Amino acid sequence: VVKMSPLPTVENQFTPTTAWSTSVGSGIGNFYSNLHPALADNVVYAADRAGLVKALNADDGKEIWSVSLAEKDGWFSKEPALLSGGVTVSGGHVYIGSEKAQVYALNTSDGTVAWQTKVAGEALSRPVVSDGLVLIHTSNGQLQALNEADGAVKWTVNLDMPSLSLRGESAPTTAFGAAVVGGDNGRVSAVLMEQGQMIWQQRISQASDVDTTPVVVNGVVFALAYNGNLTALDLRSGQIMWKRELGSVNDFIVDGNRIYLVDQNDRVMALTIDGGVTLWTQSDLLHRLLTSPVLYNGNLVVGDSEGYLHWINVEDGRFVAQQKVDSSGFQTEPVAADGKLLIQAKDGTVYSITR
């Protein structure tokens, strides 16, 4: 393994602290996972890979309800559910997918199971809810839409057979009655929410921990290819607008006039949204194994595998603060919503962070 960069010395412009922390089972341990917390109506919903799901008060982290989704039917009396994609919350349901090709819907009220559906393959990516449907990108190369009410598969879309197990997240994006899916062996496709009818498909690369989830901003689709280039596509036609050669990029977000990304070496970079030109690079975290970035209080925030959060000025890439949070480390994405910043550690502990 590559030796990571030392902890940068930062003069804190402010002093971020931990509001609260709450255990959630045994987390994801050492397995790769995209499992992360959700927040809705002042309640944080979080899970661990073994199958525990908890609802927590967002102000103090105290348990409101909890439920174990472990199977009671296997050889052994208890069998881990292998929760993986999610957590996603929408319309009174908590949606989670598993590596056993199940998708669960839990009632936000009390954690009881509203429905559970066997889908076409492993569900490693977050469920995406739109137009009354729960979209599940399965790891055997299909996109399935489940009714939010009863979990039934409304439609299925065939993609390319991956014939190669990839762990990196690949959620669909939704916009204007359509879903856009990447991570399809160098192809991006747009389909109609109504029946999964395909509208356009575009090759962004020929036939590694890359998040190939497309991001739609103002009629432009931003997409990373398995290989490492960033492409901008016209949302409605799928025509390529521009491409930037970068060499493996792990995660990116888009805001204002910038694209913020973290590459495979944990270099943090800001790019122009119209052309993908580099604006700044922050290289002090090289090989510390960063989470995806999130925007919070005007700053860019990332966690690392040693359990630190790094606060970055979006203008020039320099640090404005640093804090030690957790000893087991970070891996899954921080979540910024409703004025809060949440992050779940590898051992399962969920933190709320105060600027």
Side-chain angles (χ1 to χ4, degrees), residues 2-71 73-162 166-193 196-205 207 209-354:
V2 179
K3 276 196 173 182
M4 63 176 62
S5 298
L7 186 64
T9 95
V10 176
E11 71 172 37
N12 283 2
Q13 295 303 291
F14 51 95
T15 310
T17 47
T18 300
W20 55 258
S21 67
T22 300
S23 303
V24 185
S26 56
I28 60 182
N30 292 295
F31 295 89
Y32 182 83
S33 173
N34 301 130
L35 198 56
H36 52 97
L39 172 64
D41 295 307
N42 212 38
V43 181
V44 173
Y45 298 94
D48 75 352
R49 184 165 174 280
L52 181 64
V53 189
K54 289 214 218 179
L56 316 171
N57 183 285
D59 291 312
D60 58 30
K62 286 166 78 175
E63 181 186 310
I64 293 160
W65 56 251
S66 60
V67 62
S68 179
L69 298 182
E71 292 96 275
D73 63 277
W75 285 136
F76 294 81
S77 64
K78 185 106 293 77
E79 215 88 285
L82 301 183
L83 305 179
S84 202
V87 173
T88 295
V89 175
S90 185
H93 285 342
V94 178
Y95 300 102
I96 311 163
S98 81
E99 306 191 353
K100 291 196 133 179
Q102 303 287 321
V103 177
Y104 301 85
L106 268 29
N107 294 124
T108 53
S109 62
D110 58 13
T112 50
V113 172
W115 57 253
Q116 180 185 327
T117 295
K118 172 66 183 306
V119 288
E122 299 192 14
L124 308 181
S125 296
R126 79 197 54 200
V128 174
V129 182
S130 181
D131 299 308
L133 295 171
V134 183
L135 298 179
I136 303 302
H137 187 185
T138 61
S139 63
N140 65 310
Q142 285 180 308
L143 180 65
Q144 291 190 303
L146 307 200
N147 293 326
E148 57 183 22
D150 70 352
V153 177
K154 193 184 188 308
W155 54 253
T156 294
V157 169
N158 312 127
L159 312 172
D160 265 303
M161 184 186 69
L166 293 175
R167 308 187 297 187
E169 188 147 15
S170 197
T173 304
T174 65
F176 302 103
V180 182
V181 189
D184 181 31
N185 192 209
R187 166 163 14 227
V188 171
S189 305
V191 305
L192 260 25
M193 293 300 215
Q197 180 179 341
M198 191 167 293
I199 304 309
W200 58 254
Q201 51 83 214
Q202 182 62 258
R203 182 159 290 291
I204 61 178
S205 75
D209 190 72
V210 183
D211 187 340
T212 58
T213 302
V215 179
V216 180
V217 186
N218 295 143
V220 180
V221 169
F222 300 87
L224 295 167
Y226 65 93
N227 62 6
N229 53 234
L230 175 66
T231 303
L233 309 178
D234 184 81
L235 171 65
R236 302 188 191 286
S237 70
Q239 293 177 39
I240 294 173
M241 296 163 59
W242 60 264
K243 198 176 304 174
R244 171 81 197 271
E245 298 175 306
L246 288 168
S248 196
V249 168
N250 284 10
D251 302 283
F252 77 95
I253 64 180
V254 186
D255 174 278
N257 294 313
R258 298 190 202 85
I259 297 174
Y260 308 97
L261 65 83
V262 180
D263 81 9
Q264 72 170 338
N265 296 312
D266 310 293
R267 195 176 313 261
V268 189
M269 312 177 59
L271 310 186
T272 66
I273 201 177
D274 44 52
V277 176
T278 304
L279 289 170
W280 54 254
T281 55
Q282 168 56 257
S283 302
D284 284 347
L285 304 180
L286 251 44
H287 301 301
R288 291 182 66 85
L289 309 180
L290 302 186
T291 70
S292 52
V294 69
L295 284 171
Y296 182 67
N297 189 12
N299 297 137
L300 197 70
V301 176
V302 287
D304 68 29
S305 68
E306 282 220 303
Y308 294 86
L309 286 182
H310 307 277
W311 302 64
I312 294 169
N313 189 321
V314 294
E315 298 302 322
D316 63 8
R318 304 222 225 288
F319 297 115
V320 291
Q322 187 188 280
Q323 80 195 97
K324 181 58 192 288
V325 187
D326 178 271
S327 55
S328 71
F330 294 127
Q331 186 199 298
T332 63
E333 73 184 59
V335 169
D338 301 333
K340 296 204 178 289
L341 176 58
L342 310 164
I343 191 166
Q344 189 174 31
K346 287 184 177 178
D347 74 2
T349 308
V350 179
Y351 292 87
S352 177
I353 306 301
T354 77

